[PDB]
Design an enzyme around this catalytic site. Sequence first.
Site, PDB file in Angstrom:
ATOM      1  N   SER A  15       0.813  -1.225   0.000  1.00 21.31           N
ATOM      2  CA  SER A  15       0.000   0.000   0.000  1.00 21.31           C
ATOM      3  C   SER A  15       0.848   1.277   0.000  1.00 21.31           C
ATOM      4  O   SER A  15       1.624   1.502   0.930  1.00 21.31           O
ATOM      5  CB  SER A  15      -0.980   0.000   1.180  1.00 21.31           C
ATOM      6  OG  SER A  15      -1.454   1.307   1.474  1.00 21.31           O
TER       7      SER A  15
HETATM    8  N1  LIG Z   1      -6.065   9.126   1.009  1.00 23.87           N
HETATM    9  C1  LIG Z   1      -5.912   7.942   1.837  1.00 23.87           C
HETATM   10  C2  LIG Z   1      -5.984   6.693   0.961  1.00 23.87           C
HETATM   11  C3  LIG Z   1      -6.276   5.431   1.775  1.00 23.87           C
HETATM   12  C4  LIG Z   1      -6.774   4.334   0.861  1.00 23.87           C
HETATM   13  O1  LIG Z   1      -7.679   4.640  -0.174  1.00 23.87           O
HETATM   14  N2  LIG Z   1      -6.321   3.102   1.087  1.00 23.87           N
HETATM   15  C5  LIG Z   1      -6.772   1.954   0.318  1.00 23.87           C
HETATM   16  C6  LIG Z   1      -5.626   0.962   0.160  1.00 23.87           C
HETATM   17  S1  LIG Z   1      -4.241   1.643  -0.790  1.00 23.87           S
HETATM   18  C7  LIG Z   1      -7.926   1.283   0.999  1.00 23.87           C
HETATM   19  O2  LIG Z   1      -7.938   1.202   2.405  1.00 23.87           O
HETATM   20  N3  LIG Z   1      -8.900   0.790   0.236  1.00 23.87           N
HETATM   21  C8  LIG Z   1      -9.970  -0.015   0.804  1.00 23.87           C
HETATM   22  C9  LIG Z   1     -11.205   0.798   1.127  1.00 23.87           C
HETATM   23  O3  LIG Z   1     -11.206   2.046   1.032  1.00 23.87           O
HETATM   24  O4  LIG Z   1     -12.254   0.225   1.493  1.00 23.87           O
HETATM   25  C10 LIG Z   1      -4.591   7.993   2.556  1.00 23.87           C
HETATM   26  O5  LIG Z   1      -3.637   8.656   2.093  1.00 23.87           O
HETATM   27  O6  LIG Z   1      -4.424   7.373   3.628  1.00 23.87           O
END
Ligand SMILES: N[C@@H](CCC(=O)N[C@@H](CS)C(=O)NCC(=O)O)C(=O)O
Lengths: 214, 216
Positions: A15
């Site tokens: 990630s």
């Molecule tokens: N803008 C957020 C992005 C976090 C994000 O979208 N993470 C993804 C993984 S790379 C995630 O948890 N996706 C699953 C979901 O949102 O349900 C940050 O910088 O922390």
Amino acid sequence: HMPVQPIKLYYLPPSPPCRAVMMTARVLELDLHLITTNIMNGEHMTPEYLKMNPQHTIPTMDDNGFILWESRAIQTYLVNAYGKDDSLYPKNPRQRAIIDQRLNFDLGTLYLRYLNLYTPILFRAYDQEKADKFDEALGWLNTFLDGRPFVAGENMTVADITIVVTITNIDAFGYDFSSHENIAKWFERTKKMLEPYGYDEIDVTGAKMLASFL
Amino acid sequence: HMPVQPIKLYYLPPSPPCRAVMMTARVLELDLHLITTNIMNGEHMTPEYLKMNPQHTIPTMDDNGFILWESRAIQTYLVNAYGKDDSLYPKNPRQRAIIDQRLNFDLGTLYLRYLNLYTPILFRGEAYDQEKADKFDEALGWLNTFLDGRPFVAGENMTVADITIVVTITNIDAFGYDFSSHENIAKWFERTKKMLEPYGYDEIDVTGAKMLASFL
Ligand SMILES: N[C@@H](CCC(=O)N[C@@H](CS)C(=O)NCC(=O)O)C(=O)O
Ligand SMILES: N[C@@H](CCC(=O)N[C@@H](CS)C(=O)NCC(=O)O)C(=O)O
């Protein structure tokens, strides 16, 4: 001035926002308790995770019961709370403001355009407009770097740490950005700055995991 | 602790990020010398503007030679540099962190999904897309949850996070979105309007939203 217990990070190794936090913690010399949170196995969607973070994202931080998500918010918090000095994120309003704009640039422009370009490719071709938009963002980053060794000034900051994750990724994917002369030199520079702070262990390793899809 | 001359803001009245900055400046009691920057005419694309801001965006702030863009960085800068206190953006790391997450939520989630839903409608005459609406609605559910047991997005007091988020809620209200069933949002919206009425809420936010709404 140091945490009472290891700071928890609900994360996954590949990630990109997780990798930004992890390298920031290493520079701060904070040892995180990494908790593998498999978003493909619904581990972010249990009643327990949702109570902690109803937006159900990784990275999620837990510092002695204080919950935080958004990687760039975590980065700045770790420095504000646990930095030995403010070098990574200076309190001087104008110096801080430049960093904050670079962080907003990272989230709203560079990372977003990176996602729009590479999501269809890593998973399911390069849409032309998406390629154009990402290239445009790189041009801006190159200009940001004119006359300065780091993105927001003379010293490496949290902004450099989150921006470099994206560059490590595209580099691992075979994207050639050498024609952006400032980015090319800043990238080598920043890799060396982060070398003793788990760059290979965290960022290179994570990028290779994402690249395995190609 | 005050700017040596009025801060300049390159802007347009209906622009959501410009409106967040303008209301933040009012709450802090800073006069902005507003400079109309016609995007349509390429006024943001002159060699002069590009030298100032290579990203050629509005809002762009000029505080007496110091240039800054990105609305949310401008907001936080005005408080860090010129707040009579830090109530709008406290220095306590934990309280500051929550505000920072809400600001990142606003930029990377709420505002983006707002743009993806409404931009095609307003400026391309395309139909309302329920798929894109679903994404936006999901974010409204999250915002409603953020407001469970807090009067404001980050806690007990209004912050820069409330000010930028309220622009989006003002816009959707003007577009005919009925969010009254999101009870936390509904009460928070009435609360924040009341907080901002002595600080140009109508002349900045309501006026701006109606201008965007004329495209409907
Ligand atoms: N803008 C957020 C992005 C976090 C994000 O979208 N993470 C993804 C993984 S790379 C995630 O948890 N996706 C699953 C979901 O949102 O349900 C940050 O910088 O922390
Ligand atoms: N994330 C930026 C958004 C700035 C932005 O995209 N502004 C638009 C107007 S709403 C603009 O300057 N568009 C013209 C251009 O970028 O060339 C912020 O919060 O300030």
